[PDB]
Design a protein around this ligand. Structure first.
Ligand SMILES: [Zn+2]
Lengths: 39, 287, 32, 39, 548
């Protein structure tokens, strides 16, 4: 079991980018919440 | 003026009174008073909270009884130790926190005596562990709103740390009131005597756990674990097929053998090793 | 020079030992 | 004997590099998936 | 002479008023930028944010035209913005004895007597700001007024300016009224006494005074008195390498997160620039283990303070922490880059700080812009191309209405950081010798705490250091040298504002000439002039230029 654990964590690689949400859609969500606060 | 860095110090006991009294008569907006020493212009440290009984049927914050707070006020003067009223509270039950138009009226009746009385909401439903929904507020002058002048003159990056809710933003949290960043005062005198006392066993692990039925349960899991291992002899066989993201959406009607399998491995393991070691200590200890 | 080729290579052993301990602690603290 | 004294240290330390760096680059992706799960 | 020698080389005024000469001769700034930031007129931080920005970008140049254009927008915000307004004037008049009392003759507290005692009470703050590390009549003039004054409203600027002028001097006379400043049993004197009490005992490890401070910071009930002493007991010891570890263990063992945090500042100052294995075990460990956010922020912001000796190594370990779970370690990670690599145009660190402004937390967006400002001062497009990529970005985040005041606060602060002194001053926690520059170390560590006091990060003028060679032949006489360069000439690029309503490498330079420290090696020695330097020209500053 432990060898199936230790011979296993090399294919973790090329995990390039865990983007949170976006930048443009985050600013657009802030603009939509700004419209919800103005309304 | 203020610097919107007001830093309210309360307790470890008053929150307990707030959850108890806000929870006992929870669908009605219950209320009461706050009895603590007012420390200097920035901070306030309210060390005690005493509750006021209600007036009648109906969700309201109706009135105060100065007979009651007069007698109760001098009652602990000649029983315990003297303190001082500073603030007051009510309880938005399953709402969150804001100042309603009724709440701001009795708030306005309480800021007149001392200008730094505290408006306090407790919310005893949406609290789980790290949430409590408190957010003590206080009125701002609507005259300055007519002036178009922005108050409270930030000199410290201490008040703009928690973001206000959109629901209180619907209300007059700012246009009519402001938030205050708080924390809590605890000590080792309180931490140990509640840590060492809440979930404590007595002699329970020094038992055998129904010695005929432990091994009976040890078949009462394994028997259906066979058929679940037959589902593990089923679900692997449709691999190297349609891509496993379809094996993520497609399995939302029927159970998987993989997670359900390793569940009972943990169950059967922890059910056995504990009774195994606890069985063998008593041979040494008892004769 | 060639005398730097082992001292500068054990400096990154001083820097290299700590990392497995650090992610070793983050193994449990992400659970906690 | 500088070839057989000082250059004999070049050949040895690299073997420690060649697997401890593999240990790190395994373990940090192992951290990274869980941290993406956290956020 | 050899008798006047100790006055020439120990008082050292002929670098003070000669750097002041370099600032009064070299001044390349802009009014159009402050007219761009004029459009946000509202009663928020913005007034203090503009009058802190022109003080950040006009350090020691004595230029009162960006403040004297109006009176009403300057005096609009109140009760501490006038404290800040009389605070910001001394950095503008830094390093000059004459124009200290005579321009603030309006701002003496017994001449005008307005309704604001902060406009008149915060003057001695700036009197400490001008004559930091210059002990004269500033000590006893800032002492006799402090024997009899008001409450902790003039005592703030007098106590901080008095300890600042008496910084690291071990004076019993300032320790006298700092004792009775300490034992007031008051909250608002906490910053007043707790910071200067360590300032005057910098690097002294006076263990009876440590016992007074940490012995006093156990029974008091307020937090500013638990905060000024938290930095003071860090600041009493400086660069010890072993002589504080039982104290770091003692403060870290305590249940007080503020005092564990103060142990983190104290282990940060006991290991300045020091690659020591023992401190970074627990230093990094409690950055894991501890649960308060403040001690975690100081814990991850100890890293560049203990490892600014090698700026190549911290982007290998703090990039790993930029994606932490909480915005506190996410915030202190960006500032750990901003304290490690701020002297260099680190393309790697800018590569790390590029997505840091995208996070939905306002203050990590903020400190992304502070560290993004510290990374590229006096750098024009050729050390790294991200300079003008970010010049449009600070305007981009300051000219939006829907942004946070905090999120644009790193931009309006970043303008004064980024255009400092007409690109004549820079940060330097490090000399060419290998010895660190301790008033810039204290200046950046004290500059960290704008959380809990806004002009506590006004203590930054100690970090602004020039990059200018100076030739000299006699005690006073300027020479006439005009040397040149060899390498690519576009490195000598300028700010060059736009003002909307065949390539020379022989850059002839006068005696007060600005130059990049990377451009110290690209120049040509003067070989055809009458003057020839006896010293090999490798460091800037002032040198003898032997007339041959
Ligand atoms: Zn209510």
């Amino acid at each position: 079991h432990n060898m199936s654990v230790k011979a296993m964590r090399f294919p973790p690689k090329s995990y390039n980018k865990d983007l949170e949400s976006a930048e443009e859609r985050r600013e657009r969500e802030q603009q939509d919440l700004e419209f919800a606060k103005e309304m | 003026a203020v610097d919107t860095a007001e830093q309210v110090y309360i307790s470890s006991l008053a929150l307990l009174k707030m959850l108890k009294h806000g929870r006992a008569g929870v669908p009605m907006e219950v209320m009461g008073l706050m009895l603590g020493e007012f420390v200097d212009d920035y901070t306030v440290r309210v060390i005690d909270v005493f509750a006021m009984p209600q007036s009648g049927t109906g969700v309201s914050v109706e009135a105060v009884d100065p007979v009651f707070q007069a007698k109760m006020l001098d009652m602990l003067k000649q029983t315990g130790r003297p303190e001082m009223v500073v603030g007051w509270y009510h309880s938005h039950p399953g709402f969150g926190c804001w100042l309603s138009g009724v709440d701001i009226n009795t708030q306005q009746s309480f800021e007149a005596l001392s200008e730094r009385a505290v408006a306090v909401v407790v919310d005893p439903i949406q609290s789980v562990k790290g949430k409590v929904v408190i957010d003590a507020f206080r009125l701002i002058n609507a005259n300055m709103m007519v002036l178009g002048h922005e108050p409270r003159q930030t000199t410290s990056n201490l008040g703009h740390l928690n973001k206000p809710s959109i629901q209180a933003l619907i209300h007059g949290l700012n246009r009519h009131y402001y938030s205050i960043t708080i924390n809590y005062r605890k000590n080792e005198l309180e931490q140990k005597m509640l840590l060492n006392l809440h979930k404590k066993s007595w002699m329970e692990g020094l038992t055998l756990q129904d010695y005929s039925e432990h091994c009976k349960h040890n078949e009462s899991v394994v028997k259906e674990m066979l058929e679940l291992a037959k589902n593990y002899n089923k679900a692997v066989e449709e691999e190297d097929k349609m891509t496993p993201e379809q094996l993520a959406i497609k399995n939302v009607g029927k159970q998987d053998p993989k997670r359900h399998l390793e569940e009972h491995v943990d169950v059967l393991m922890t059910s056995n090793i504990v009774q195994c070691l606890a069985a063998m200590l008593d041979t040494v200890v008892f004769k | 020079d060639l005398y730097s080729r082992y001292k500068k290579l054990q400096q990154e052993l001083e820097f290299l030992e700590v990392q497995e301990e650090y992610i070793k602690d983050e193994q449990k603290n992400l659970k906690k | 004997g500088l070839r057989q004294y000082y250059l004999s240290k070049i050949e040895e330390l690299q073997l420690i590099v060649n697997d401890k760096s593999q240990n790190l680059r395994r373990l940090q992706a192992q951290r990274n998936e869980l941290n993406a799960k956290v956020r | 002479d050899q008798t006047l020698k100790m006055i020439k080389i120990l008082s050292g005024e002929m670098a003070i008023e000669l750097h002041l000469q370099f600032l009064i001769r070299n001044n390349n700034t802009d009014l159009m930028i402050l007219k761009n930031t004029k459009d946000a007129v509202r009663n928020s931080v913005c007034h203090t944010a503009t009058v802190i920005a022109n003080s950040f970008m006009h350090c020691g140049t004595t230029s009162d035209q960006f403040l004297r254009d109006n009176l009403e927008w300057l005096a609009r915000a109140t009760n501490w913005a006038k404290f800040t307004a009389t605070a910001s004037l001394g950095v503008i008049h830094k390093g000059h004895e004459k124009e200290a009392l005579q321009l603030m003759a309006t701002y003496l507290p017994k001449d005008t007597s307005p309704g604001s005692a902060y406009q008149e009470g915060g003057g001695l703050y700036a009197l400490g700001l001008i004559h930091a590390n210059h002990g004269g009549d500033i000590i006893d003039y800032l002492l006799n007024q402090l024997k009899n004054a008001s409450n902790d409203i003039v005592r703030h600027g007098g106590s901080l300016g008095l300890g600042l002028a008496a910084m690291g001097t071990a004076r019993q006379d300032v320790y006298d009224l700092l004792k009775t400043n300490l034992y007031q049993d008051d909250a608002v004197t906490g910053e007043a006494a707790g910071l200067a009490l360590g300032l005057v005992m910098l690097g002294s490890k006076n263990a009876q005074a440590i016992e007074d401070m940490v012995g006093y910071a156990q029974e008091t009930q307020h937090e500013k008195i638990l905060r000024g002493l938290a930095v003071g007991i860090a600041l009493v010891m400086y660069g010890r390498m072993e002589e504080a570890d039982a104290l770091i263990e003692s403060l870290c063992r305590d249940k007080d997160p503020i005092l564990r945090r103060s142990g983190m500042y104290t282990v940060a100052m006991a290991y300045c620039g020091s690659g020591n294995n023992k401190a970074i075990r627990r230093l990094l460990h409690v950055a894991v283990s501890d649960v308060n956010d403040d001690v975690r922020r100081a814990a991850v912001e100890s890293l560049g303070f203990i490892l600014f000796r090698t700026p190549e190594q911290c982007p290998s370990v703090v990039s790993l922490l930029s994606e932490s779970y909480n915005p506190h370690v996410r915030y202190g990670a960006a500032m750990a880059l901003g304290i490690c690599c701020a002297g260099t145009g680190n393309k790697e660190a800018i590569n790390l700080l590029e997505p840091m402004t995208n996070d939905p937390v306002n203050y990590v967006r903020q400190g992304a812009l502070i560290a993004s400002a510290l990374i590229m001062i006096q750098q024009t497009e050729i050390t790294c191309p991200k300079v003008n990529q970010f010049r449009q970005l600070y305007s981009k985040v300051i000219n939006d209405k829907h942004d946070d005041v905090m999120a644009k606060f790193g931009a309006i602060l970043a303008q004064g950081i980024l255009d400092a002194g007409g690109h004549n001053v820079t940060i330097s926690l490090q000399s060419r010798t290998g010895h660190t520059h301790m008033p810039s170390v204290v200046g950046v560590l004290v500059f960290t705490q704008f959380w809990f006091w806004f002009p506590l990060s006004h203590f930054l003028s100690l970090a602004y250091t020039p990059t200018c060679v100076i030739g000299l032949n006699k005690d006073l006489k300027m020479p006439k040298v005009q040397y040149k360069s060899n390498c690519k000439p576009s490195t000598f690029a300028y700010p060059a504002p736009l003002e909307v309503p065949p390539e020379p490498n022989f850059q002839l330079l006068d005696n007060p000439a600005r130059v990049m420290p990377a451009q110290l090696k690209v120049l040509t020695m003067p070989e055809t002039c009458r003057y020839q330097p006896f010293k090999p020209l490798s460091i800037g500053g002032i040198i003898i230029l032997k007339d041959t």
